[PDB]
Design a protein around this ligand. Structure first.
Ligand SMILES: CCCCCCCCO[C@@H]1O[C@H](CO)[C@@H](O)[C@H](O)[C@H]1O
Ligand SMILES: CCCCCCCCO[C@@H]1O[C@H](CO)[C@@H](O)[C@H](O)[C@H]1O
Ligand SMILES: CCCCCCCCO[C@@H]1O[C@H](CO)[C@@H](O)[C@H](O)[C@H]1O
Ligand SMILES: [Cl-]
Ligand code: NA
Lengths: 445, 445, 451
């Protein structure tokens, strides 16, 4: 008898994402070490350091150890608990029933105490089933944290490279705008120009120069996130983060069969294990509806005179079988069973919410990424056309055939176009991170 | 007797919102089913389905069931607790007081055990007062969750419509700009234009084209959000969410008396019930300064020989009145009572914080909504003037009385004004959501 | 004897912020009342009201009271627990090993019951040590809340002044825009202008006018945050928030020595205290490897007849010494010890995480502050050049020597540059707030002899 419900994993349908039978994706294989596809040795080294150094990941390993330990304690309860004891009871007073004289009472005991719950309705088995499930939930929390940390770290490296790239674009445009300002001064100083042109050229220059330390500020915050993610102090970063291009993936993304994502994601597995544990805890409570059968025991020495402890004349053994049942207090037991039942329903609903959220995340990740590819195509044209316009406009302002606002406006748009394209490239990179995060890549899978 | 403080609900003054005596608002009625004023049957359907499907709401129902179960367990402690038992003590050794010969010894017992706490100072009455209040707190948490879920979902629908409206504005402006690009080519080719016009028109068209998939991406995210809020997978959502106009409310908003808002909001009642519970708990702890009167009992059979259990010559009864009092351990009792007073002071301050947060949310929503109405008036005027500007610039550019930049800039401003007016209409719809969430609209009794 | 590990504070190296040996910072002093340097008596009153009224600070202080009361209860376990009792056992049945007759049975007891765990391996001393350290983690949680709340309140005052500043600038740019609209109309009606000029000037006015109620909305939301942070209802604010300038500190920033920052941060002390409690808890579990020794007792009266209770004839006493040891259940004691040790690893690891997060907030605050100063320099220039361009473009438009677009564009850049400058001024103010928050400003570390 192991009473209560026997847990079965819910019959959860595979994820279905149609968007993935398309050019951008390769369903034939899944890459577990998904970040290496960027081909960036600096990134690969950040990730390896993270996995040895991160303090959140280290808390999660410790919690996994703690959970195993809880389990190990509970598993002993299937066996008699045999402890040691030496005690005495000594006093003087009446002894009602026997005498109204005040007489000396002495008693000495030395030996083994035994306590055993016979697990006839599986109360104890259910407890262990529960702790086993909680131990596996802790393993899966640890794996999720790994998935989460790697995505966060790869993502922050993206933001660093982005700030760097945008800084480079700001300073490149700042030189075009300085050339323009210098031309407005030259034409003004040769008597064929205007202060108005110079003032507008100064203002635009100053706007562009203002963007530079803001972008450097962002890059620094990203260096500092990266250091914390690595388990390192900000000034102690080992890995060199001097600018390099934003990484890129050429090939179609190896995403495997999107219908395996719910099986691969550890957060799903962790919530499924919590549901398993909770379901076993209904069994624990269900056992209290039935009688409890216990078996106490003593083996050693009992004596009225302390001097005899240890001798054959004081040998003693005792056995204490006991059956308890709640009887008229079954109402209380039923209340606790309803408690355990409500908690298992909370756990199932919570499991289902995790599934739903996981499907929401992957549906977003794939929807975003398709759309971000399309957007980038339009941004690349915008940048090419902008540049060509700003070049033509600079020529014509020099030659006297267009007003300064034509060159100013064309310069503003070139900056705006180039910067927007960079941001869109960063988004694509981060969209890749989001896809692999939502698929549960990076724990070993 | 019932020791400790008698709980009284704090005398919290009514919310006062002076800005509600304006024209935007109707204080003569409150609509509970506040979203139905949008007259959007698709919205109505979404809300009804989320009330049966949402999984966070299912979790809260189950938490309520858990709390009622704790309360039911406590309620039985008012009465003698009567369990059943069959035990035996079997052994061989000395029997101190009686003999030093190692003898066989047997005791059998079978019957009913009684444990009764007389509760003369109302310790148990107070325990039940606390558990009852907490069941009510769990019921209020459930209702605050409905309020928050319905606001979240109405708001997401708004965002979905917003992105659909903005995609529509972007595509409409994309056509105007495509007509402009074709005009620059045509005039260039006919010999009265310039490559510099065409390049610039190419860049702006691409910029507008680029916005379209970003808007579409956002529409897809809001759709996936709605699906999870309904308790559905993204691909199972059957509700037809193809574009419709952003809903609007043309009559003054029925907001009722804003002095009722603190009584309506379930968050406030949940924090009030937690306060009532912690106050009962002070009662529990205060009761331990006084003696505890109890009464134990046995009714059944007691025998020296297993043979006799069940027979008349083994009938036994037993009664154990007991009075205990902490005496020199009152330091420990006083320490717990201080603990309980501190907890009740936390719960009081936390209730006041919730009140002040509710008034803040409420003050923001009204202040926001008034300003978003005024702001929209100016944006409507901006959009009108801009369309007329763009219209005229296009006539003037075709005719040869203005330069391409004038037309380019007027089209930029048209898009920018139109898009901004759209975002402001979306803000207004969300302003209405914020108002009703802040008044505690939309929960079931 | 006290068993298990003896806690030593980690040897945590000092923070090193190279960037702070610079002209913007004065490392010779630290002001713990860091907001007073803005020399803004309105702000100073907000802060004092907040400290009297804020409800979250009351919650945290009440949690600290409860933690100390818990610690006081655990402290009593080092001594005999002596309770009092009056009782009886009355019945009818057999009495095994005595008679098989159903006899009447009566018994009365009255006196003191005593229970004592003799704390020979320090189980109870370690419990008290854990519970004291958790007390301390609660004083420090409260102190970290106060640092956070002060920073949040000062930051919100800044946003409020920001929003008032930007509304002033929008309104001022609106007046220039209206003068320009008037001119497009005159030039039109005098046969030397264009309807297209009037139309674009109207679109621009409406755009600028649109921004005003949004800035007012922002300012209202800041007033309302301020009120909740003071423990006040939104319409009952006691401090007048009518527009004033965003405060400034011209003096170089008194930041002390950056290698003192980890000692000044209460969030660090809290996490360190939880690590100390958790290490004590290893001790608690270690003590269960060893025997437990107890002494029970009774002193009072025992009798078979009720009337005799209280008299000499019925005096009574007993003593009940005891020693147990887990023996064959040692594997359980060991599982719990492995568990306690795992929890201590977890705590050391959170303590270190908190240190790293504290160094990241500090690095970011100093980094941002420096960059924000540089940026403001360029934005001040933008504003100066834009204002002058717009003045000139107006002269030129009036002359018949530009399309209106030259003026319209110069007026947008003037508003856009001034507004950006005001935003950057707000961001510098908020950067100051982020520096002080990261350094653990806003509480008194020297109080209570530190510990
Ligand atoms: C009237 C005299 C009776 C004589 C009885 C002798 C009791 C011996 O006494 C016992 O001796 C043992 C070693 O032999 C010890 O281990 C015991 O602890 C001790 O109490
Ligand atoms: C077991 C014998 C019964 C002893 C009962 C003594 C009754 C105690 O009496 C109570 O003691 C408290 C002292 O802290 C006070 O707060 C109460 O006001 C007082 O009435
Ligand atoms: C660990 C021993 C606990 C001592 C109780 C101290 C009670 C008050 O604690 C004080 O609260 C203030 C805010 O209310 C903080 O500014 C102080 O730094 C803090 O010590
Ligand atoms: Cl982190
Ligand atoms: Na009960």
């Amino acid at each position: 008898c192991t009473v209560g419900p026997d847990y079965r994993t819910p019959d959860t349908a595979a994820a279905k994402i149609d968007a993935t039978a398309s050019k951008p994706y390769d369903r034939s294989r899944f890459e577990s070490l998904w970040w290496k596809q960027f081909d960036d040795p600096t990134l690969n080294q950040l990730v390896e350091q993270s996995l040895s150094g991160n303090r959140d990941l280290r808390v999660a390993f410790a919690r996994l150890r703690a959970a195993r330990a809880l389990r190990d304690d509970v598993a002993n309860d299937r066996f008699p608990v045999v402890t040691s004891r030496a005690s005495a009871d000594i006093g003087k007073g009446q002894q009602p029933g026997v005498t109204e004289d005040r007489v000396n009472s002495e008693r000495y005991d030395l030996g083994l105490d035994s306590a055993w719950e016979l697990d006839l309705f599986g109360r104890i088995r259910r407890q262990l089933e529960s702790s086993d499930a909680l131990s596996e939930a802790a393993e899966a929390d640890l794996q999720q944290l790994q998935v989460s940390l790697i995505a966060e770290l790869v993502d922050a490296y993206g933001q660093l490279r982005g700030a760097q790239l945008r800084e480079k674009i700001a300073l490149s445009n700042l030189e075009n705008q300085k050339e323009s300002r210098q031309l407005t001064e030259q034409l003004r100083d040769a008597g064929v120009g205007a202060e108005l042109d110079v003032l507008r050229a100064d203002a635009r220059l100053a706007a562009t120069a203002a963007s530079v330390p803001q972008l450097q500020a962002e890059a620094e915050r990203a260096r500092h996130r990266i250091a914390t993610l690595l388990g390192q102090r900000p000034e102690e970063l080992t890995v060199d983060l001097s600018p390099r291009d934003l990484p890129a993936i050429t090939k179609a993304l190896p995403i495997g069969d999107p219908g395996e994502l719910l099986r691969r994601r550890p957060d799903i597995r962790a919530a499924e294990r919590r549901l398993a544990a909770s379901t076993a805890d209904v069994g624990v409570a269900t056992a209290d509806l039935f009688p409890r059968v216990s078996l106490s025991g003593f083996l050693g020495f009992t004596a009225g005179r302390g001097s005899q402890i240890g001798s054959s004349a004081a040998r003693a053994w005792s056995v204490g079988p006991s059956i308890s049942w709640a009887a008229f207090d079954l109402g209380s037991v039923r209340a606790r069973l309803r408690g355990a039942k409500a908690d298992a329903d909370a756990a199932l609903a919570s499991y289902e919410q995790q599934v739903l959220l996981a499907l929401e995340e992957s549906a977003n990740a794939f929807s975003d990424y398709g759309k971000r590819q399309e957007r980038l195509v339009s941004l690349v044209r915008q940048s090419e056309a902008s540049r060509a316009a700003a070049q033509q406009a600079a020529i014509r302002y020099r030659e006297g055939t267009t007003d300064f606002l034509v060159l100013l406006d064309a310069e503003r748009e070139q900056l705006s176009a180039e910067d927007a394209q960079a941001q869109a490239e960063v988004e694509l990179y981060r969209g890749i991170v989001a896809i692999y995060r939502s698929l549960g890549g990076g724990w070993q899978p």
